[PDB]
From a paper:
Here, we present the structural and functional elucidation of CPR-C4, a hypothetical protein from the genome of a thermophilic Candidate Phyla Radiation organism, identified through metagenomic sequencing. The function of CPR-C4 as a cysteine protease was predicted through remote structural similarity to the Homo sapiens vasohibins and subsequently confirmed experimentally with fluorescence-based activity assays. Furthermore, detailed structural and sequence alignment analysis enabled identification of a noncanonical cysteine-histidine-leucine(carbonyl) catalytic triad. In all crystal forms, the structure of CPR-C4 is a homodimer displaying a mixed αβ fold, with a central curved antiparallel β-sheet surrounded by short α-helices connected by flexible loops.
The CPR-C4 protein, including an N-terminal His6-tag, crystallized in two space groups with different crystal morphologies but similar resolution limits. Surprisingly, the two Zn2+ ions were only present in crystal form 1 and were both found to interact with the same chain (chain A), in a tetrahedral geometry, as is most common for Zn2+ coordination.
Residue numbers in the entry:
A (entry chain A), B (entry chain A): 1 to 38, 45 to 217
The structure:
Amino acid sequence: MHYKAQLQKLLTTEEKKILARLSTPQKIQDFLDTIKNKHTMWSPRAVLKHKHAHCMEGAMLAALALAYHGHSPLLMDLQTTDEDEDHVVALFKIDGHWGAISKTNHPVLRYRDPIYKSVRELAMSYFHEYFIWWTKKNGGKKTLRAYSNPFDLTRYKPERWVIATGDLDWLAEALDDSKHFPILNKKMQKQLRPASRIETKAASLSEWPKR
Amino acid sequence: MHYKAQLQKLLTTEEKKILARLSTPQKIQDFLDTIKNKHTMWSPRAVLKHKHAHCMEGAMLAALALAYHGHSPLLMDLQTTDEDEDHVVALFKIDGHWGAISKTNHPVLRYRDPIYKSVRELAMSYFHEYFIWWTKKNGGKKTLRAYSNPFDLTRYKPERWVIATGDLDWLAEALDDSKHFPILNKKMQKQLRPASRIETKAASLSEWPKR
């Protein structure tokens, strides 16, 4: 309630009217679906203004909306080899089970229903669909290597990220530097099989055109 | 070794030459990739003859090839609502971790690398990608509800399935009747969100044409 009070001090009437509607994790994901998928690392304020977001911008807005209704604003980092880019989601729980809100342009690394018994279990549900699909060089290689502990944005003064103008590279870097848990050892990595051609083709589909 | 001996008594020279090559789970999956995806429920013999298979025909051949190299021939049933069809995979383990060999025509319910710490964890990696994609009626509804214990085909005389002529509906029925574990309760089911339009479109892609 205290955290929510701090948020209300920072937000305009329009912002609060939006956040008030987004009262369930499902409603939040529905809202992110209407934002155009994509320089900089916008605040939730900027995202609501310009209605454009990459993954971490999407997750930060989700975390804000979750916090506005009394959930912890939690991020999880999905960390890849240098061949790929990391992905960030907003974690949530309902009746003891983990779910995830996700902003992505492709049919992989999507929303997760609150049915996963642990962070690990949820994270593992992404592994098989995190692969190189955009080039033939290591075509189909599975690139996920680690997941973060839930990253609680409560540790910061909300001004620092909710309404920031300053570009939040520091926040991205803090997330990347937090505790991560490896998914493989060296033996397991050697076992990995590439995704099939049908899988890479499917992953390549786009929600929003690359205009 | 005893089980393998029984298999060798039943198999032709050609059959054994094939099974001898398929010495890793990865090699087996590669082989199933060359079989055309699809009445009846053919034996591994029939599948090797006609080079055509649905999911359970694929999994039984996989289980045979696994057994020929000393693994348990294990099946896992993935059980859906009445709106969908069940799917069967062949489970395997390498260094204490579960993987799965799978025969499917679509970019979902595919192979799983041996990295999953439990049957449950592996089964849960399929949940989000098991949905209605072929009609608008309950379009995108997530239909997986339970997974079986590993089903060891060792319980039967190998003649009964490896080289059967008789159509193996009884084997399918025995699998469906084995111990299953629910994934949801009624509360969780009410939380479920439909897959997106981009997801149903991606799932609809076909490896083999529907000629």
